[PDB]
């Protein structure tokens, strides 16, 4: 499952694995690498984070090695991270359908539903979602910015 990444990603991940190579033997901690798992073209939940932090840790000494590092980073590229299906997703709570949900309603929508969030991951969300900055989540520009990395 290490082959699903791109070759440029593989080189930058040689770099990145060496970056967290606090062990030196060719293994890097998975929890601190958890932030790496969210950046390069990946969109994981905290549940998906922890699953691929612990499950893909095949060597299992808490610090995952480079082939399994590339294995880790490619598991997320399987999930259906599409752009319009999630605009439909917000319309379940954006009964207006204009592309706007209130900040309290959004904190509602994710501290409670599906993969329930942590509040430290919700304040950042209201901030990065209310790009307009009016106490009101603009989930459309929110789409445009999460589709970016």
């Amino acid at each position: 499952m290490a082959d699903q990444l791109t070759e440029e990603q593989i080189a930058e991940f040689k770099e990145a694995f060496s970056l967290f190579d606090k062990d030196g033997d060719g293994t890097i901690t998975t929890k601190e690498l958890g932030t790496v798992m969210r950046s390069l073209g990946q969109n994981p939940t905290e549940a998906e984070l922890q699953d691929m932090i612990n499950e893909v840790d095949a060597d299992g000494n808490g610090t995952i090695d480079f082939p399994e590092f590339l294995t880790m980073m490619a598991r997320k590229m399987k999930d259906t991270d599409s752009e319009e299906e999630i605009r439909e997703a917000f319309r379940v709570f954006d009964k207006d359908g204009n592309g706007y949900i209130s900040a309290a309603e959004l904190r509602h929508v994710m501290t409670n539903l599906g993969e329930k969030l942590t509040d430290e991951e919700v304040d950042e969300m209201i901030r990065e979602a209310d790009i307009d900055g009016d106490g009101q989540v603009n989930y459309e520009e929110f789409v445009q910015m999460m589709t970016a990395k």
Partner: protein, 54 residues
């Protein structure tokens, strides 16, 4: 009607439950996208300096 409305709203409400997992997956990435780059600079400089040392 209890069972029928049960299943009929079951479809919609499971749809909603998948809706919000859909939202959560593609949100929770952006927060670590910055802390990754911080370490990218901090340790790519470490390797630049390792070359500088050798």
């Amino acid at each position: 009607q209890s069972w029928f409305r049960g299943c009929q709203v079951r479809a919609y409400m499971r749809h909603l439950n998948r809706v919000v997992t859909i939202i959560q997956k593609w949100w929770r990435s952006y927060l670590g996208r910055k802390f990754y780059q911080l370490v990218v600079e901090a340790a790519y400089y470490t390797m630049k300096m390792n070359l500088y040392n050798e």
